[PDB]
Structures are given as C-alpha cells and as structure tokens.
Amino acid sequence: GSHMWIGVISLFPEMFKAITEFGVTGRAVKHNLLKVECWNPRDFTFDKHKTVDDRPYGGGPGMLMMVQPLRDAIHTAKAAAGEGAKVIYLSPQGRKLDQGGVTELAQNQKLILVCGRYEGIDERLIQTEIDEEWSIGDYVLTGGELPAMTLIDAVARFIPGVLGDGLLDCPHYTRPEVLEGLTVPPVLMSGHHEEIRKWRLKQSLQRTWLRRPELLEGLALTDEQRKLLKEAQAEHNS
Amino acid sequence: GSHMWIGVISLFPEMFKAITEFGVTGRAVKHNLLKVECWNPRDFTFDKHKTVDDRPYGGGPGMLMMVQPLRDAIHTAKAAAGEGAKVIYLSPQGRKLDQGGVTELAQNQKLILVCGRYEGIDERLIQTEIDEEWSIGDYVLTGGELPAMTLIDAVARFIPGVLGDGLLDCPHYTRPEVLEGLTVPPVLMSGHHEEIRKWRLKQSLQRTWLRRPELLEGLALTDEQRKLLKEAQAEHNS
Ligand SMILES: Nc1nonc1C(=O)NCc1ccc(Cl)cc1
Ligand SMILES: Nc1nonc1C(=O)NCc1ccc(Cl)cc1
C-alpha cells in the first residue's frame, strides 16, 4: 500500500545488502514493501580506468567525486524514479536527523539518496541536483553509505506491514527471574496491567530526566506524566 | 602500530561485510590496521530451533533478546579480547555520539560492541555486562548493527595509516570550470595558498553560523576566525 522506493547512488552498492538481505528490512524488501535500487557512478565512466574521483580546485590533501559520472548516475536515477522523487545528500553539513525528521522523510513515496565518498562532491551539484541535505550525526564517516542505510532503516519502520512520546525507553526484563543476584521488579510479575503501564511510564520519565533532561524541555507533559515525574524526582532526592 | 580490535555481538554478522569488504575500512581490515570479529548468539543456543528471543515480563507487544545465548556470546567475546576491552551497548538510551566522543572511544585498543535486535535486552545484562551505552542519534532503528558499523567507521578514521576545528566544511569544487552556468570562485583558481585558506575558513565560519549556530557557542574563536566571521556576517547583511 504505502510501499516505498529508494534509489541509491553509491560507489559501493554491495554495502546495501546489509539492509536488503537481513532482518526486518530484509523482510520488507522480500515482501515488496520496500524497494532499494542502486546506481554506481563507476558504471557511468568512459575512460579505461573507470575514474570516479577528481582534484579539487584550490588544492588540498583530498579528492572529490568526479562530476560527470556522478551527475550522470543521478540523472539516471531521477529518470527511473519519475515525478515526485526527493533527492537527498547525506553529509555532516546537513540538517540533523531525529525521529521527527525521520517521520517527515517517511511521508515520501520516493527518495533518491546520494552517497559521497572521498573528501566531498562539487558544490554546484548540491545546488543543482540535491533537494535536501541531511546529517545522521555530528561525526565524520568515510562515506555516505552507512548514513544512507541508517536513514532507510529508520524510515522503513513507518511503512505499514514492516513491523509486527519523546521519552527514552523504560527498562525491560525477561527470563530468568533472578540474574546475577538481580531480581525482576515485582510490579512486572503482578499481572496488573495499569500498575505496569504507570511503572514503565514513570521509568521512562525518570531516565529521560536523568540522562537527557533537554528532551523534557521540548515536551508538554500530561497531568499523569507531571505527577509520575514529580514522584520519581522526589524518590531520587530520597 | 595503533591497530584496533573490535569484537561484535550480532544476530546478523554478515551485515558487517559492508565495512570489512569495501572502501577505506575494507582496506584497513586487509592491512591488519583494523580487526572485526563477530559472535552470533544463535550459535550459543541449545534448543532445536535455535531460539534467540524471549517474552518480556509484564507483557507488551514486543520480544527481547533471550538472555542465555546473548550472555554466553558476550562472555566468549570477552574471553577472546582479554584484559582492557570496553564493552559498548548501542541504543537510543545511550550517550549521544559526536566527534569528540568518537575520539574518546578511539583511544581504546579493544572494544566489544553489543548489537540489539527486537524490542530490547534485559536490563540486568546492561547492569552486569555493559561498560558504556552510546547512541548514534535520536532516531529508532531496527537493530544495533548499523550504529555499531557507524561507530567502527568513525573510530577507524583515527587509526594511523587508515587515511591517506568544530566547524562545518567549506564548499569544494572540481572540473569543469563551468557547470550549469555556475562558475568556480576565482580565488580557488588564483593559486594564492593564503587567500585560498582564508576563503575556505571564512566559508566554514559562515556556513556554521547560518546552519548550526549552536556549534559556534562551543568554540573559542581565534582572532582570525573572529574577523572572518564578522566579515561574513557583514556581507550577509549586505
Ligand atoms: N555524519 C554524516 N551524516 O550523513 N553523512 C555523514 C558523513 O559523515 N558522511 C561521510 C561522507 C559524506 C560525503 C562524502 Cl563526499 C564523503 C564522506
Ligand atoms: N539510535 C541508536 N543509536 O544506537 N543504537 C540505536 C538504535 O536505534 N538501535 C536499535 C536497537 C537497539 C537495541 C535493540 Cl535491542 C533493538 C534495536
């Protein structure tokens, strides 16, 4: 129904087997809920050695992706996608991805993801070919493929059929009842669904406050959430 | 010399071919600068169907990783690593990764990365087996493998031999001189190394100010950087 098509431009398309052949995303691909289609700039070269990098104007230690093979690969992906495809470039200079941004990106039925390698791509290609630039985090990687796969994995979770409040998750427990002397909180064994719900919510509120208090600032807590957070803060202060 | 060993606990170890077989990280592995060794909890099961998940106490829609196979895999990885290995769990509840955190993690000669699947792992395993919990970003993925590979890629860049100031990168240009009517900034063609350096720095300062002004707050700018940022802000205000 709400299946998603993702075109990828990458010098290493075989990396994408990590998401198309395994786990939840692998299942999504097999079931046609997600399609990932790759184009490799190396296939758009014409010289004997299939050159895909080029020297930066102004000098410097690094190389950039060569414009012509990359541009031709992007154009081919765009032609395959048809109308309505948003072209995304992954880099540390982009908009910071968070779950809200994931949900925004997931509204697209078609995306094209451009994966950089080496020390950059020509700025004029960003101006002329790229719709949006996004970053998965404030760290530097060797290429855009892992960020692209990260984005695909995150948006895939919103496609209906793929899976079976601003707070961190609560602790979870499974067998055995006692592990290294540590027991399961009795509330989780009580079978009281309402008590269990409130315990889990209180724990999420407490953990968010202690570990990521800035996340709480962005929330308008419900009356119930205000109460449970206040209880948690009181207990923390003994 | 400063080679790094990374042990990985994962239900899908073949995903890690994405970093061990391709690009800069692939080269690092071939050259013995980086070693990535995987253990699969499925191999530590004893039942006929090799069960690796289990039901959460207190109920709920999800499953957790089964404790015994996961615990045994972690212990085996620890035994292989010997003394000094830091055990890392990847999840959205962890410390937010940034380049500074990458450089901190890169000081370790040995890491063990635990990759979760399903809806969590038992909290008591985090308490008893995990040294540090880290997040690659405020979004939710289907498993910890992509975050683990992201971390590996980022820290690998600091291993000497693997590769050939708090600001966003500047624009880069390569051939052709004119692309879709857009020309290369004449300064980059001038061959004046000092003018080129200052242009690039000014551009990084301008881009950081416009796109990520909060990053500037964390910096103590040099006199030169203060001057170039002021120039950029003046030109932006016409
Ligand atoms: N952080 C991030 N969020 O998205 N992408 C990144 C990142 O570091 N990419 C590496 C990269 C990106 C472009 C080129 Cl040309 C080379 C390497
Ligand atoms: N964000 C992040 N930063 O590190 N990891 C993540 C993440 O979403 N992992 C998915 C995940 C983690 C543990 C388990 Cl049990 C299941 C799924």
Side-chain angles (χ1 to χ4, degrees), chain A residues 21-29 31-47 49 51-82 84-194 196-197 199-220:
Chain A
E21 300 186 346
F22 307 97
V24 168
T25 52
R27 184 163 13 263
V29 168
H31 293 357
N32 298 320
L33 305 178
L34 173 62
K35 185 166 198 294
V36 172
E37 191 165 358
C38 299
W39 287 268
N40 184 344
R42 199 169 298 268
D43 295 331
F44 295 82
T45 62
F46 294 103
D47 68 312
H49 297 289
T51 300
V52 294
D53 58 354
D54 206 349
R55 298 179 78 186
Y57 286 116
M63 299 289 286
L64 305 184
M65 302 184 82
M66 187 182 175
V67 165
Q68 172 265 315
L70 172 59
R71 181 174 186 262
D72 290 351
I74 291 171
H75 287 183
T76 296
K78 286 183 182 192
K86 174 167 298 180
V87 185
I88 303 299
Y89 177 52
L90 284 317
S91 94
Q93 282 71 240
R95 172 174 174 192
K96 186 75 83 51
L97 187 69
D98 56 21
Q99 192 63 4
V102 170
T103 64
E104 292 187 25
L105 287 169
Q107 300 317 293
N108 296 286
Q109 196 270 310
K110 304 170 188 173
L111 293 176
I112 297 165
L113 310 181
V114 179
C115 306
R117 282 272 159 173
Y118 315 120
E119 285 59 66
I121 74 179
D122 192 280
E123 186 72 5
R124 295 164 298 176
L125 283 181
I126 297 176
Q127 299 177 241
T128 61
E129 301 295 341
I130 301 302
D131 293 307
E132 305 183 3
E133 189 164 9
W134 289 81
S135 169
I136 62 153
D138 288 333
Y139 36 81
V140 182
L141 307 171
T142 65
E145 284 84 3
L146 291 173
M149 279 186 278
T150 296
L151 179 58
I152 293 166
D153 182 285
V155 299
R157 295 184 69 257
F158 288 88
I159 304 172
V162 163
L163 299 181
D165 52 11
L167 303 171
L168 300 192
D169 206 6
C170 59
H172 305 292
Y173 299 80
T174 184
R175 303 182 295 165
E177 296 192 34
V178 186
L179 183 62
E180 298 246 11
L182 305 174
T183 55
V184 178
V187 61
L188 301 179
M189 317 283 287
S190 73
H192 190 167
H193 299 302
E194 179 67 357
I196 289 164
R197 182 189 66 83
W199 181 87
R200 286 177 168 160
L201 178 55
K202 187 177 186 172
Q203 289 285 316
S204 285
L205 290 157
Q206 178 174 83
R207 281 148 66 91
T208 307
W209 170 56
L210 292 174
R211 303 184 183 191
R212 301 288 310 279
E214 77 275 14
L215 292 180
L216 285 181
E217 298 301 326
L219 300 178

Side-chain angles (χ1 to χ4, degrees), chain B residues 89-92 116-118 120-121 134-137 139-144 147:
Chain B
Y89 177 52
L90 284 317
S91 94
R117 282 272 159 173
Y118 315 120
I121 74 179
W134 289 81
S135 169
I136 62 153
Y139 36 81
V140 182
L141 307 171
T142 65

